[PDB]
Design a binder for this molecule. Structure first.
Ligand SMILES: *[C@@H]1O[C@H](CO)[C@@H](O)[C@H](O)[C@H]1NC(C)=O
Ligand SMILES: *[C@@H]1O[C@H](CO)[C@@H](O)[C@H](O)[C@H]1NC(C)=O
Lengths: 109, 50, 50
């Protein structure tokens, strides 16, 4: 999974948050693009921009009316992939000042 | 007149705190689905101080 | 009335409705001011006038 899109129209007419985890770095922007189809494999009024089975990754995404808050954790698991019931806690990453209205989201895969 | 400075006259709901919105769509005041109709039932919302 | 001699026709002791007006294309011109047309139906007055 390369990352996420969050917004309302998800392309054109208004801003929509794009987050790409581009291998070495996170890359983030708020103007729209048509890209979706296959970025995971080898084989415009842009008013904000930012850069920064045995493993289970956990995230929380929140919009606090203002800002966009992200928490995460990286956890080891056995290959029983259905969320083994061992308790875990997620820690803050970022608190981005984006101010964008959001109702819908999508996954980059 | 310096018309280059503008404000949104109305919106279908009030902003949430620090919600930022540059949308240029026609505000529907009445029954007409606007589609470029302006000045009655429908209005362009970005007014100027001039 | 002739406009140099315009008339203050009194309205009193009754409930108004401006929504039946602002929804309607029944006039060669219609305008409302100071508040959104939706807010007019919340107002109260000692008298109203045509
Ligand atoms: C973006 O993608 C290329 C190829 O995957 C990579 O070299 C680069 O380090 C990535 N990150 C940035 C910020 O360009
Ligand atoms: C940027 O937004 C303004 C309205 O805020 C609009 O008039 C303009 O056409 C937009 N330009 C681009 C390149 O999207």
């Amino acid at each position: 999974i390369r990352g996420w899109i969050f917004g309302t129209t998800l392309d054109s007419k208004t801003q929509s948050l794009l987050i790409v985890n581009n291998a070495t770095n996170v890359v983030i922007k708020v103007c729209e693009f048509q890209f979706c189809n296959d970025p995971f494999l080898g084989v415009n009024n842009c008013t904000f921009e930012y850069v920064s089975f045995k493993n289970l990754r956990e995230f929380v995404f929140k919009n606090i009316d203002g800002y966009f808050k992200i928490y995460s954790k990286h956890t080891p698991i056995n290959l029983v992939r259905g969320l083994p019931q061992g308790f875990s806690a997620l820690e803050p990453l970022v608190d981005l000042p984006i101010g964008i209205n959001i109702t819908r989201f999508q996954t980059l895969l | 007149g310096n018309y280059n400075y503008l404000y949104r006259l109305f919106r279908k709901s009030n902003l949430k705190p620090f919600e930022r919105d540059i949308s240029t769509e026609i505000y529907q005041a009445g029954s007409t689905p606007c589609n470029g109709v302006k000045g009655f039932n429908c209005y362009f919302p970005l007014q100027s101080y001039g | 009335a002739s406009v140099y001699a315009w008339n203050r026709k009194r309205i009193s002791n009754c409930v108004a409705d401006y929504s039946v007006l602002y929804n309607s294309a029944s006039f060669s011109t219609f305008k409302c001011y100071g508040v959104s047309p939706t807010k007019l139906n919340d107002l109260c007055f000692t008298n109203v006038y045509a």
